[PDB]
Amino acid sequence: LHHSEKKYAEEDQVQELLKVLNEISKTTLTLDPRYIWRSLKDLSSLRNQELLNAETLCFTVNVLYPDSSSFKKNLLKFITSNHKSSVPGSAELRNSYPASFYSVNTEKKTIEVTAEINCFMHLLVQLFLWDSKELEQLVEFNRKVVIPNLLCYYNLRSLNLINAKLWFYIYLSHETLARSSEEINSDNQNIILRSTMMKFLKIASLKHDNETKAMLINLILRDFLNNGEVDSASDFISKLEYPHTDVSSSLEARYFFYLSKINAIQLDYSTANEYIIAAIRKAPHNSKSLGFLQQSNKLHCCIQLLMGDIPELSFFHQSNMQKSLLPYYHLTKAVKLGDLKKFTSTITKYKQLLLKDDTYQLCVRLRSNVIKTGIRIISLTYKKISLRDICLKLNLDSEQTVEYMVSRAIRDGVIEAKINHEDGFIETTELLNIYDSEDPQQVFDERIKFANQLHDEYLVSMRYPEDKKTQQNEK
Amino acid sequence: INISNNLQKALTVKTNDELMVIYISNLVRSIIAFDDLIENKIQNKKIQEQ
Amino acid sequence: ILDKIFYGVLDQGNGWLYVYETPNQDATYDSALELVGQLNKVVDQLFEKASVLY
Amino acid sequence: LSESDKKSKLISLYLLNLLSQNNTTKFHSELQYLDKHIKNLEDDSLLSYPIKLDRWLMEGSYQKAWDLLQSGSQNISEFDSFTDILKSAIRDEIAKNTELSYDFLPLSNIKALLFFNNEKETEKFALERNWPIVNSKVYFNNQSKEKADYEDEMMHEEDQKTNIIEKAMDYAISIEN
Amino acid sequence: MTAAVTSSNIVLETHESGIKPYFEQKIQETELKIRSKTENVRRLEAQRNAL
Amino acid sequence: TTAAPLLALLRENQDSVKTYALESINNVVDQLWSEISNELPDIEALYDDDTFSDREMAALIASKVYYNLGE
Amino acid sequence: RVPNYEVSEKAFLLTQSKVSIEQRKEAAEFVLAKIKEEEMAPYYKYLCEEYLVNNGQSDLEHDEKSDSLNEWIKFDQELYNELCKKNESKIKELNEKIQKLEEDDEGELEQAQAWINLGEYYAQIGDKDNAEKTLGKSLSKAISTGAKIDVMLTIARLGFFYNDQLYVKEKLEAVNSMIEKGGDWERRNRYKTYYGIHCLAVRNFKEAAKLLVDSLATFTSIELTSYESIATYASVTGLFTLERTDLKSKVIDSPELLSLISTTAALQSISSLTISLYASDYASYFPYLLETYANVLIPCKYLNRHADFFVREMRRKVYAQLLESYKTLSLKSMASAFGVSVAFLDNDLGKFIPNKQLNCVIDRVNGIVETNRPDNKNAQYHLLVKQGDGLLTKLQKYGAAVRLT
Amino acid sequence: MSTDVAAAQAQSKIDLTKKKNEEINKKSLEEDDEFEDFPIDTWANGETIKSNAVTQTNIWEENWDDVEVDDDFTNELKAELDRYKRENQ
Amino acid sequence: KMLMNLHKEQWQSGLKMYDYEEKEESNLAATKSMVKIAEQYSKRIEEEKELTEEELKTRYVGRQDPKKHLSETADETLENNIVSVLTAGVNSVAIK
């Protein structure tokens, strides 16, 4: 019954044990171990649930414990204290094996290679708490222990790969609690949460590991977005240390999403385009990822429009995400037609939805874009029309009103016209040719540089598998 | 310069196409290496024996 | 005009007929559009050999 | 202790101060910080003022922007110390626009736009902004081109323009490497 | 693996633990060269083998 | 929190106000270094003054900021 | 065979709220009668589902509500008797007979052909899945190329019947390869008329047109809609695609069109619209347009959905043709010729300027319409950078996925 | 839903450990649920069931005719309104 | 050294060019010709279904390669247009 479940689970865990321990004891294999860990972890959290929830505890029982028995005993007891051979060090099935922690060696404290394993065991635990939503006290306790525990280590490269994943849950559980409900407790721990990440990021530069570094920059840029401190995000960007050397595709993808947000609130749109497109491309196109793509697609509307290019009607039409991007389709149509009344109506009705995604603050600014388009339309159609007629059409207040919109539009050059107040009409000064400008030179430069970029990327990549098959014996 | 870009885009297909063909050669070389690995399993028993 | 006999536009209001010679097109660009089309077919096809890989 | 009436009071003044430097970047940064707890808690009830104003400046709807100053009278205490700074700036933004929009205008129509109640105060702002009114007509055909040139003269990105010659070379080495 | 649960003579034990990866960091910035070396030497060598 | 109030308190005339402000910075010199980089010439200014008596901490605060940047 | 297309046309109209009551119910009688008669009763389960909250929506297998104007959605026990009666006789006969053709001693003639025989009965009653299975068995075994293409057309037709396009789409792409293997110019023609219809359903008139001129001369109707219908379809596609002179050759001087005359309400109106574009008649262009919307586009099952796109395009075409010919025009002048007011004209013009077909600015001071022309070498330049930009996206994304491997 | 052997189908993709990494990590921004959160709340539009899916998410390519919702009634009324004045002159 | 130099009006020639009528002609000929081998090029990659490099070349005539003739013709017109822009752009600003 209960005894059965423990042995069956523990065996499954031993298999996984073997694979990872061989790597670290045969010197770091760097990229390779990160790949192995994720796949094992997906399998393992799912396992944890069935055949008792003491699956994690079994593994701790048949291995040495520098500090792992203490944590496992705290967790168990909380979730109703239970005795079934579940007090670590109870059952013995190591039997003098270096692998499964030699009997003799431990007493003396001759072997102390548990550390990395400890990171991984905690790592499963953080994730199981999250799936359950029994985060709460259990999660806070793990977090407590684990901060002095990393500072007790003088870390190695393999262990940094694992702690880059611990760090993901540590940020998040604080967010989870704060996001339930504002608590006086939540405030105190935010300031704490910021400090510790900062501090650890300085150490992780020196040890020289990409994963710990990239991950920490990402968590901290997201911390900045919630608190409205754009300035602290800017100085942070300006640090410059964000590497590209071995960083996962998960970390880059999140990286670019944040960049898009940070530039747009401080009134730069140019550079936000490149990243909002990049961020869709690095992210994969699965259903479990669909949510992230819904976030990107909402942002893509604001960013694009403020720069002064209309994003595809098509892109939002022919998605499955069309219902999420239903209020947003209605933003795009309002701008297109130039109708003020339409845009105002949209943002009133859907206001509650828009606030969650944090697109709403960007929408106050998108008001400005609606108006310029309405007068842009009139200028293309009509070369000479009296500003009297322009007032009627877009339902503006006076003759002074109509002048001051059009006057600003031409400073930025968007309408490109000339106002005549003593000949009583606006006359378009549109040249509207770019084939007898030095402009095409400037476009073609980007296209050519991108193309060569790819020719090199084919060349470099091509060789590495060829080399490996050559090492292996074949005819 | 337009023609240089359009001509260069042709060359972007050429270079990329070849990439797939090498990974085909790598694919074949692992089956061949497997047959070798089987022959070499047998060879090791001879070594012990003799 | 529409039958393309003399290739001009008749200015109604000033009672003039502007006569123009044959509109030119950059033959070089026109052939560039024919090339681009072919290239788009070919890359779908690249991808089809490139899914046997995985 | 995050609630006081002077909290709303001061928030409004800080923001007025960001507009009056004429850097809307420091404004939007502050605005994202204010929009959570603080803005909802105190509600808008003097917050309404610096936010609507700022908006009327993105638009180029100075008729609304100039109007807001006047409604400042009703809450008068120390909002006057920013309103004076804001007028000269509101007038400045218009003058920037007027250059490119058109090139010459009668004296009465310039007065109307830059907001003065006397024709003479219009010509005084002319001389400060270095623009000649002669025979009651402004000219930008000379002036606009002059000011842009002295400013546009720089020796740190004017030796970087990216030559045609340079672009040909740059392509060239990418093919054989 | 290093410990810092217990310390003795006013963090003497862990003062020494802190400065041993910092001595070896000099050697690790030189190892980042040798780690791009492995990839580029095998790259141009296979290139030399087809020629 | 933000360390910007502490930098603002540097500007005030009494020596007493500034010495206390620099100590507060030190609690979170690697832990909240972002603002200090930007307003760094003030801390240096306080080192260069020979009438300032907490020169020694101003040099340290600076030292730390350059360590965090990568410099 | 023949019953399958003609019932579905009429049934679609039963769905429409765009046709008049009179018309809708003229159709509704034809539907119900020929389903009970030929045993299309399995399809009738589908069709109730298809009407459902447009017009028709009181049912004994779907939504109960009184905003139905149709009784020809509603089930009957007369219908249920019909189902059962016919099904059991026919089926019983045909299963035992077929089985023996395959049973006895001959697998290249008799076994292949028997599967066609199952297939006729499934195709008759409109069950798609079970028609796809049997006719798979015939194709799989080895037979004439001609039979292989012919069998496959029937499967395609079942998609066209259901008003589902993805199903057609899968079928005719396969067939297309087998055409040059048989070397049959007869069944290339029969292929063309099918592909015509497929291109027509989706928005792509460009291919439709090339094929539809071909379908006037040659086709023999094999589970497809009349030659009156096809002739009408050729007219509509003709205006859209082809310039003035090609409009003249291919439509007006077509021996095929000339020899079929105008014998239906829809052909009568469309032939009138072709002539007036060509004649630089402008008065009768707007009247002819309203009549073609009602009497051509709406009664279609393929240009009822493209109605909005089509009417927007011709409106843009007529304005374009006059401007292409005229350096200056007056708003009053242009508007008299068309038969609309000056005000009504100005709107429609200013709507279409940003869409870059018209290429004209319009002054309100003097009321003159100046005609600019920025399309030339400059035009071809915008297209190239845009398509090239897209191509670049494709190269990086396919590339990066493989390099990882 | 599998067709042929499973050999061809292991040769056309083996799932990546890289994708596993991307998916879970993104989920933190996606909150507790944000994959079905929006179409749960809005009830997938409050409108008639009908039988077409060419209003939104059409099979054929999206061309702009969202501008006018029906310019055919409008063009009718315009023509008829001039019609009167003309005739009665 | 005498033997290595073979020209003396090499300096003059490197800053001359032809008439620009035949340059435009080469650019058109190049683009139009690459369409015609691009058509074949699509057909070629329909195949590549026959085991062994040699078998492919013998059986489906893999030697008459469309691949080879596109790459080479693209290369030729491409390299030429780099030089053409380079020469002409030097000439206007240097001389004047």
Side-chain angles (χ1 to χ4, degrees), chain B residues 36-50:
Chain B
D36 204 268
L37 178 287
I38 300 305
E39 289 159 74
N40 310 323
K41 189 166 170 196
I42 310 171
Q43 267 178 301
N44 291 315
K45 313 175 67 59
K46 329 188 157 82
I47 308 169
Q48 299 219 126
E49 192 171 73
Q50 303 292 137

Side-chain angles (χ1 to χ4, degrees), chain H residues 3 5 10-11 13-14 17 20-21 29-30 33 39 41 44 46 50-51 54 58 60 70 72-74 76 82 84 89:
Chain H
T3 178
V5 286
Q11 198 42 86
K13 181 151 180 76
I14 296 166
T17 73
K20 300 184 195 35
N21 207 125
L29 305 175
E30 311 171 30
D33 186 46
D41 289 320
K50 294 195 281 303
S51 289
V54 290
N58 54 355
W60 45 93
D70 176 61
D72 280 274
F73 196 89
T74 337
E76 185 153 52
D82 190 60
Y84 289 133
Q89 181 171 125

Side-chain angles (χ1 to χ4, degrees), chain C residues 20-39:
Chain C
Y20 301 143
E21 301 299 288
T22 324
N24 275 296
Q25 295 288 278
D26 207 322
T28 321
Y29 283 22
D30 284 293
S31 290
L33 283 160
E34 279 193 314
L35 192 57
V36 173
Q38 297 300 107
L39 305 164

Side-chain angles (χ1 to χ4, degrees), chain A residues 171-395:
Chain A
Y171 186 63
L172 195 50
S173 49
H174 181 257
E175 309 289 317
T176 306
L177 185 64
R179 278 197 291 206
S180 297
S181 49
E182 290 292 319
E183 271 191 48
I184 62 185
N185 193 59
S186 287
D187 296 287
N188 306 137
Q189 317 178 338
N190 198 227
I191 314 159
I192 299 173
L193 189 85
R194 187 170 305 127
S195 297
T196 52
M197 286 185 286
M198 285 294 190
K199 187 73 174 175
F200 207 95
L201 181 51
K202 304 290 179 293
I203 311 172
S205 182
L206 311 188
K207 294 307 188 164
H208 299 303
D209 182 285
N210 286 295
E211 280 69 53
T212 312
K213 187 175 298 192
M215 171 61 85
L216 289 169
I217 291 157
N218 312 145
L219 293 173
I220 297 177
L221 291 183
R222 177 185 169 192
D223 195 335
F224 300 144
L225 293 171
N226 306 325
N227 291 108
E229 310 187 66
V230 172
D231 285 308
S232 315
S234 293
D235 291 344
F236 214 46
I237 293 161
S238 296
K239 185 176 194 192
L240 206 70
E241 54 180 47
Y242 194 84
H244 293 309
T245 313
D246 290 305
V247 173
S248 179
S249 59
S250 176
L251 315 181
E252 305 191 285
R254 294 187 300 136
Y255 175 64
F256 292 127
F257 180 56
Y258 294 127
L259 295 200
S260 300
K261 286 198 180 174
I262 279 164
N263 291 329
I265 48 184
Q266 63 193 267
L267 320 183
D268 192 12
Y269 309 109
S270 291
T271 82
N273 293 322
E274 313 175 76
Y275 315 134
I276 195 40
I277 303 158
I280 288 160
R281 289 193 284 199
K282 296 293 165 170
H285 305 309
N286 305 126
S287 295
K288 211 178 173 43
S289 297
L290 188 66
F292 178 89
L293 299 147
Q294 287 177 200
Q295 305 171 58
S296 306
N297 281 23
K298 294 164 198 295
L299 197 51
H300 180 92
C301 298
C302 305
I303 292 185
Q304 213 72 34
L305 289 174
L306 291 149
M307 179 64 187
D309 280 288
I310 324 296
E312 309 176 58
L313 312 183
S314 184
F315 185 23
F316 315 120
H317 191 274
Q318 303 187 245
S319 58
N320 66 356
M321 308 165 246
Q322 203 301 116
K323 304 296 189 73
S324 315
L325 298 168
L326 178 80
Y328 307 85
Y329 185 53
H330 312 158
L331 319 170
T332 313
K333 279 194 284 194
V335 182
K336 189 179 58 47
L337 300 157
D339 294 326
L340 201 50
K341 53 185 166 54
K342 200 189 150 77
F343 183 65
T344 319
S345 297
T346 308
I347 72 172
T348 320
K349 202 173 166 310
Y350 297 123
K351 193 184 74 174
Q352 183 171 33
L353 299 320
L354 305 183
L355 195 64
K356 197 172 191 166
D357 288 295
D358 313 294
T359 56
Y360 185 63
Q361 304 92 264
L362 295 59
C363 285
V364 188
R365 295 208 295 288
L366 280 176
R367 206 207 193 232
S368 197
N369 285 118
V370 173
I371 306 167
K372 304 286 171 307
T373 316
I375 342 166
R376 182 60 185 172
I377 282 156
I378 290 174
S379 63
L380 298 162
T381 60
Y382 300 143
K383 174 169 163 285
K384 285 197 295 178
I385 196 170
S386 194
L387 67 145
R388 190 256 305 157
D389 282 281
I390 318 185
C391 192
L392 296 168
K393 278 175 179 72
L394 293 188
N395 299 117

Side-chain angles (χ1 to χ4, degrees), chain D residues 128-146:
Chain D
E128 306 171 56
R129 196 61 157 87
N130 301 96
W131 301 324
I133 306 196
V134 288
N135 61 255
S136 319
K137 293 265 215 178
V138 71
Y139 285 100
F140 301 124
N141 45 277
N142 313 282
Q143 288 305 322
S144 205
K145 300 168 186 169
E146 279 182 11

